[PDB]
Amino acid sequence: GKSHGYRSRTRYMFQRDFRKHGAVHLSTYLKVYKVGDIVDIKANGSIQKGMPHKFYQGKTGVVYNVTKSSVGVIINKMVGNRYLEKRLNLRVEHIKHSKCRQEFLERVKANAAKRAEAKAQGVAVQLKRQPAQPRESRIVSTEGNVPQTLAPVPYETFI
Amino acid sequence: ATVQIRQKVPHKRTFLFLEQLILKHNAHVDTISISEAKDGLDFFYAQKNHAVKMIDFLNAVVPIKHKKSEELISQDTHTGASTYKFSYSVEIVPICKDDLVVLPKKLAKSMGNISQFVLCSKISNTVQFMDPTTLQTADLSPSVYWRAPFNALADVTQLVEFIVLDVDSTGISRGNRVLADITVARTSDLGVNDQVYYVRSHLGGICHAGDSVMGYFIANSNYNSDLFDGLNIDYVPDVVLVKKL
């Protein structure tokens, strides 16, 4: 009949890679996880212990518990009409940091730097980002540059 | 028409014997095709009478039980013959040639006052049991079997090698030199510290020193039959020896 095991349908998701077989590089273990940090889940096929279920491949949560081999990760999973709050225990092979959080933390240092310098200047802070704007009018110089007339091409087979 | 042959055993010994025996008498001539299944095989016979010829052949050589059913095809109007496509479902008795078998208490008293703890010898038309300790034979026709079916305690897959030491014949013989005491030991316990089992067997006349025999070793098994649980555990022998080589 049917089949709903713990690692069903994970033929291509838990493969290792092409030309990345072998033990993991040691800078994976050396990273530091503090409570609250944002993490991404990407299940290493090599280390079977502490390995996430196939749903949580690619999800993103928060560090709340830190133990010897593993980190506590909370992921919001939807079922029915509702968001549950589910807790995981993943070893440090599978977990990895998120650059989208890390680039925000540098942008806070840029924002705090602008405000103090603007205050000594004394006007016009302008801190918010803007989306892309429609471009301004300008003159295009045809000097040394004459327009080249084109035409549609007729049909040829060349088969 | 179809004769559906089945047998509920994982290792079919009786059914392999039928395929050898179906060839010699040349009983299958009227087959259209042959399919296979999980626990047996299917035969396809073009006419109804040719299907009946096979079950009368299976009645003679192998213990069977069968029943028939049909379904409509055409629903003819003028003639009336409505073209029923038949099906015959034949079931082989799940007791093999060398099953160690524990009989029910009412059944074992009815035939020959035999002990409940027996073997099998004559897999042919009616199933025949043999008491290996004190020799005695008892039959079991399928009409006695299918009214109250049971199973086999062990099978032909838990057999253990044994090494015979000497053959001590008491003397009484039915037809194959019965009740000869055999001192025997496993192949396992021989090179290691000395363990000796001493037990009667029917395999007395054909057996000599230094010959390997197969057999059931009861004392290391946790069986789970309630028929076995209604026995007297200080009367059940430790070793039952089945066959030579």
């Binding site: 709340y64 133990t67 919001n76 009409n81 968001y83 549950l84 807790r87 | -």
Partner: protein
């Protein structure tokens, strides 16, 4: 009499009538599941700083 065994039709439309809404995650999350060596220390550190503010600052 066969029946339609399973369908997910009209399921997502039933979900969004009330609102998927987030669990809204209050301050001071529960320490159930945290390493009990850490919880045993965290008991005393609060009892220290409450005693430290009480006597020194009033």
């Amino acid at each position: 009499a066969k029946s339609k065994n399973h369908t997910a039709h009209n399921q997502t439309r039933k979900a969004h009538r009330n609102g998927i809404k987030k669990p809204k995650t209050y301050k001071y999350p529960s320490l159930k599941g945290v390493d009990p060596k850490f919880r045993r220390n965290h008991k005393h550190a609060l009892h220290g700083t409450a005693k430290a503010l009480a006597a020194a600052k009033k």
